[PDB]
Amino acid sequence: SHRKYEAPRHGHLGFLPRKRAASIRARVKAFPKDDRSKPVALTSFLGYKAGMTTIVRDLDRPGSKFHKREVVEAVTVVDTPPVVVVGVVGYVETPRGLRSLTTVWAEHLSDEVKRRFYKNWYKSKKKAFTKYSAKYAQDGAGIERELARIKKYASVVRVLVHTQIRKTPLAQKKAHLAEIQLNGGSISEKVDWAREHFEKTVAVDSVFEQNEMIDAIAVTKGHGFEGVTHRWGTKKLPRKTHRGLRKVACIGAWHPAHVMWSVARAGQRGYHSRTSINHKIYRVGKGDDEANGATSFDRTKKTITPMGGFVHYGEIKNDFIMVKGCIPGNRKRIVTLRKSLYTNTSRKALEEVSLKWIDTASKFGKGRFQTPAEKHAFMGTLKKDL
Amino acid sequence: LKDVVTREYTINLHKRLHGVSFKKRAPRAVKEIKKFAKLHMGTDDVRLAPELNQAIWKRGVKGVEYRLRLRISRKRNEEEDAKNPLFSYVEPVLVASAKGLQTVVVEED
RNA sequence: GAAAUUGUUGAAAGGGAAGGGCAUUUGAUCAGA
RNA sequence: CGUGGAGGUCAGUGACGAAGCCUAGACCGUAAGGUCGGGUCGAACGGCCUCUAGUGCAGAUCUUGGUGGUAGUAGCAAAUAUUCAAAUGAGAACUUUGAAGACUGAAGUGGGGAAAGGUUCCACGUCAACAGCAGUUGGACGUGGGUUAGUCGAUCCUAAGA
RNA sequence: GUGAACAGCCUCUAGUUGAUAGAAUAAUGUAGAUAAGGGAAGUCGGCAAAAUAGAUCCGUAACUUCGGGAUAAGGAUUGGCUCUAAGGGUCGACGAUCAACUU
RNA sequence: UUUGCUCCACACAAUAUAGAUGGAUACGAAUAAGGCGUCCUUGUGGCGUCGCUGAACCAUAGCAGGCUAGCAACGGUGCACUUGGCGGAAAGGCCUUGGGUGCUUGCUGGCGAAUUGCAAUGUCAUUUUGCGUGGGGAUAAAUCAUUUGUAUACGACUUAGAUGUACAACGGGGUAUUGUAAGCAGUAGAGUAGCCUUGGUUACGAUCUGCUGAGAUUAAGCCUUUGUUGUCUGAUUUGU
């Protein structure tokens, strides 16, 4: 017989299977459509989720109840030191999809990216790319031949970039290497840009700008094995239920004589790859810029780092991207920020945000002071010091 | 790491017993101290002085002190089998406070 | 000192059973002249 | 066709190996089956003509016995709780001693008894089995020792009753 | 000891420290708990849980077989410390001396 | 690495064969239209011709194809080199230069074949592997164990570790939580009970005040570190 009362199904069938992502770095499965009249530029960037804070800004939204009024918004900080270009990959189109034809690497690779090719770095002989570096012996004839092949072919060009994880407070010490598509046409000059940027850093400000809507691609926080009640949001069974109530009561009708894929079952929760879109960049902050957390209204010479440091992350000493809201993944996790795949003109995008204040109070508790100077001013002289 | 040596350490038992079941806190402290001595002296054979066990259990099974000042002596032993011919022997230091003390080489005994 | 059941060795086969019938290939083995 | 036993016969077979058993070795019969080779084995057995029956198994939630997959799986999670060192020992989470931490908290996890048990009491030796882990320990195993009454009970009296 | 108390909790004498252990801390469980705002809208049904609770003082309805209902209902207080007052025995209106708690 | 690995050449062994036995011989498009040739004023042009299947084209003679003598002509073809170009959809092939060299059945000769006994696939191909002999080339990792917690039931995942912007244990600082530690002192303290220099002092006294936003805790999944101390070659496995 029928359900006897309609209700929407629990969970989204388009995010199946609810399995662990194959890698801690979520893959970029679609790059922005190439506009071959633009200059050559990266379509994404690699950063590390540092943590969240809150900001205050004047809302510019005509017709809204809060137009020209102050709004408090949550923001996520992604530490984004410049990424080092170490290779270029050429992609030819085939009746069986895109196919990498060849990769040309830089002559010199730092130990940060060399660690990525080693499971046991400390006891290895560090031979990686030692014979490849000899391709640059006198004139780089083999390197130029491979680049000429990429120019003669490979309708799609991607660069190999790696993070400078040594510039982050993370203990990992092993860089993250990823392919970023080069948009801005003339495949010839795509390859030329890649080669000219070999071994050179690319700053996040050359990829992303203030107010730009971007997408965050990251592996979500893992939670291990989870029951149906929290994994899928199913109704808790009554207190009277024998054999447990954090379950799904009927996992299927008699026919089909099988548990169906669409029934909620207990299993892994989290550690899934997610591509969340339309996060507006609130700040493109620079690492060398003291007063990073300052605005034109605050003027307090303070960095973006909360007092006591970002909890479980550390201090932001590099360039950072501050996006509105939250993004998938937890602190210290590598996240790929990519340009939007379409042109958003909904007046939510195209809004020019101007921060009025950035919270730098401690996230290690109910933080009361933005700066140590403010703490001193409020508290006066203590016995230990200050 | 192959000779005899005596050093005094402060073990942060608080962070090692964080979240430990109350009925297991003192035994877990004993095992954590054995692990501590093994980590520092490279000896699998760690022996605990009964006075040190008394200091561990002084305030019951769950009242282990946050910090314990210990004297660990890596000494050589000769018995039926070699079986890690070096062993560590751990004693309490009997100080008034176990705070603000660094690792020191005793250098005399 | 059987069988069920089991170990080792040897041989053989094995994409959601296995086993069987007719026929022949291949491998092993063998009688009769 | 085959089986247990019986009369006759082959002056049948056999410790120089009967019967039995094993044998993707061979032969005969359409088949029930029969025959042979090899290994194992050790004391009886077979062909034929007849006689005889407690004479042929795949089943009966068949009977007895044995054995699997499940499966090194379910599980060995109530009674607050154990820890350090030494001794013994081949072997110690579990024995002993010492130290510590705890509990029963006198309506006890204390000290005695009635019913019941019958040596479980104690000592020495001792760990194949039992103590659903272990064991050097034990209410275990082996060998011994131990229960002393004119006054405590039975014995005597009568009760319901026999 | 606390306490009205052979209640509960802690301790003394005595006894035991005997329950297979070790490492982690997923889901679902068993047992114990908490929870913003709402307050039975859940459910057959307030099942379960929560709320109340001791003592002192105040106050206590319908009905009634006049005995009860009744701890009805509904309220206030409670610690610590320093004091004060009252409540006794013996010996010869008082004097001496001694002594324990209850309000 | 009890002389390891890879490639090439040769020899010898195995190993099998979804099945060779002259050649898979390359426009595209239309089909109520085309192919080819030719011409011009170059087109959706004129003229001629073809199909009616590949029953074609190429190749094809020689002890499974031997040994030799010539003629004719600078052709055909194989081999190993060599010049250069093109081809990325799975290119791994196509085209091309020059010389060398073998054959040439384009034509004319000489020698040989037999007895596999009247047939018996009468063995001629390619697929991998091993081994030996020479030559060419290179001189790592992974896992266990330890560690991390961005992970986790266990596996798994993510990290670190052979001398350093290294790691760890403490210590320091920051951050955060709580709420003012112990100790000492006090013309504080409701007071009660003693003593006399009757304005003080003795005993007890919840509590109060000051040192004291002090003291305690703070990563166990917080941040940081000019300090102290220490650690850094254990095991197993992997070859085209």
Ligand SMILES: [Mg+2]
């Ligand atoms: Mg419906």
Ligand SMILES: [Mg+2]
């Ligand atoms: Mg949610």
Ligand SMILES: [Mg+2]
């Ligand atoms: Mg029920």
Ligand SMILES: [Mg+2]
């Ligand atoms: Mg916080």
Ligand SMILES: [Mg+2]
């Ligand atoms: Mg916990």
Ligand SMILES: [Mg+2]
């Ligand atoms: Mg026998």
Ligand SMILES: [Mg+2]
């Ligand atoms: Mg058998």
Ligand SMILES: [Mg+2]
């Ligand atoms: Mg399968």
Ligand SMILES: [Mg+2]
């Ligand atoms: Mg019979």
Ligand SMILES: [Mg+2]
């Ligand atoms: Mg025989």
Ligand SMILES: [Mg+2]
């Ligand atoms: Mg058989």
Ligand SMILES: [Mg+2]
């Ligand atoms: Mg005999």
Ligand SMILES: [Mg+2]
């Ligand atoms: Mg019968």
Ligand SMILES: [Mg+2]
């Ligand atoms: Mg049967």
Ligand SMILES: [Mg+2]
């Ligand atoms: Mg039947």
Ligand SMILES: [Mg+2]
């Ligand atoms: Mg049966």
